[PDB]
Design a protein around this nucleic acid. Structure first.
Ligand SMILES: O=c1ccn([C@H]2C[C@H](O)[C@@H](COP(=O)(O)NP(=O)(O)OP(=O)(O)O)O2)c(=O)[nH]1
Ligand SMILES: [Mg+2]
Ligand SMILES: [Mn+2]
Ligand code: NA
Ligand code: NA
Ligand code: NA
Ligand code: NA
Length: 323
DNA sequence: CGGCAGTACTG
DNA sequence: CAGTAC
DNA sequence: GCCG
């Protein structure tokens, strides 16, 4: 819808990789706004008006129109590309990237031979290219089906659904986010051990990034899988097992988008409520720092519509939550 | 002034 | 806990 | 970065 965002996106990523998360959040919102406006902004007024664009941001959008080039883009630290390169390794965030840079590292060859890697980062580096590729949704289906078949094998009751970008109807998916639960509200307990060992038996899972299997309270699995046959690449696979009672909130959460959940959760807070992947709460007590000090009551939410409804919002289809 | 979402692993 | 990621 |  607009081409002034492609210029801001560069700045947003620069602040993000440098650790200035709040400023980056400000640019991210300004960009999600613009991309949502049909009539390309033209006047300073037409800028400030939009929510997520203030003086500072409006001034920048202008330069992109009267000059066709944002000046600041020429004053971005030469460290950014390397910081981005490093933070694109799964398991390494801004802190790790900055430390490696300070240590003199400038390439993945440097990381491979000189940096000490956590177990997750070593896996992330091994699949550096794979993890940056998005798969066609058709492949995401086969993966969701492979997990669903392995799960229903020892319990046909298990309800399995692919969420995230998949459920939002995108053509390509960065990974496959599978939600698993059960209508009886109890048979979901202690299944990770079984499901994972099953997927491991047929050679589907190749690496584990996060999987607390010694804990019978395991809620999530983040790992790597690869379908059988030639021409297959390793793909990221996320799985969460939730009790039916939290099905609507888990589904809403896992479906996203991320910026969508944040906005929805921010809204609930303004209403003295609290929204999480576990439930929607009301009468929540908090302090001046927006920090929760009181639990509050869990509200009944058997469906996603219920969540929207309780928050006083019209229901949005998954594809309409792609923020 | 100061929050900006709420939560689950890892070591 | 800080860091990281969903 | 934005906004209450
Ligand atoms: O910061 C986050 C990240 C994810 N989420 C939720 C929403 C998101 O859609 C879901 C799965 O996260 P992914 O990282 O898998 N993203 P998504 O599936 O939307 O896109 P992609 O195709 O990149 O995987 O978890 C959050 O609430 N906060
Ligand atoms: Mg995803
Ligand atoms: Mn995911
Ligand atoms: Na505005
Ligand atoms: Na990253
Ligand atoms: Na990373
Ligand atoms: Na583990």
């Amino acid at each position: 819808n607009l081409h002034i965002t492609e210029k801001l996106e560069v700045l947003a990523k620069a602040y993000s990789v440098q650790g200035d998360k709040w400023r980056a959040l400000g640019y991210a919102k300004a960009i999600n706004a613009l991309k949502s406006f049909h009539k390309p902004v033209t006047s300073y007024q037409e800028a400030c008006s939009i929510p997520g664009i203030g003086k500072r941001m409006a001034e920048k959008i202008i330069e992109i129109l009267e000059s066709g080039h944002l000046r600041k883009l020429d004053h971005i630290s030469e460290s950014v590309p390397v910081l981005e390169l490093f933070s694109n390794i799964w398991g390494a965030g801004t802190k790790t990237a900055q430390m490696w840079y300070q240590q003199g590292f400038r390439s993945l060859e440097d990381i491979r031979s000189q940096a000490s890697l956590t177990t997750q980062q070593a896996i992330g580096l091994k699949h550096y290219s794979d993890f940056l590729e998005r798969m066609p949704r058709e492949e995401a289906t086969e993966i969701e089906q492979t997990v669903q078949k392995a799960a229903q094998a020892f319990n046909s009751g298990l309800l399995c659904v692919a969420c995230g970008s998949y459920r939002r109807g995108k053509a390509t998916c960065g990974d496959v986010d599978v939600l698993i639960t059960h209508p009886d509200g109890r048979s979901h307990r202690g299944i990770f051990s079984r499901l994972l060992d099953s997927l491991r038996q047929e050679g589907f899972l190749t690496d584990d990034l996060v999987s607390q299997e010694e804990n019978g309270q395991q809620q999530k699995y983040l790992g790597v899988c690869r379908l059988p046959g030639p021409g297959r690449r390793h793909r990221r696979l996320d799985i969460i097992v939730v009790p039916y009672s939290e099905f609507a909130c888990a589904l809403l959460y896992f479906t996203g988008s991320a910026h969508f959940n944040r906005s929805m959760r921010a809204l609930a807070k303004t209403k003295g409520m609290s929204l999480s992947e576990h439930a929607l709460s009301t009468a929540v007590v908090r302090n001046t720092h927006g920090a929760k000090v009181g639990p509050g009551r869990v509200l009944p939410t058997p469906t996603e519509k219920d969540v929207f409804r309780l928050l006083g919002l019209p229901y949005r289809e998954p594809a309409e939550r792609d923020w």
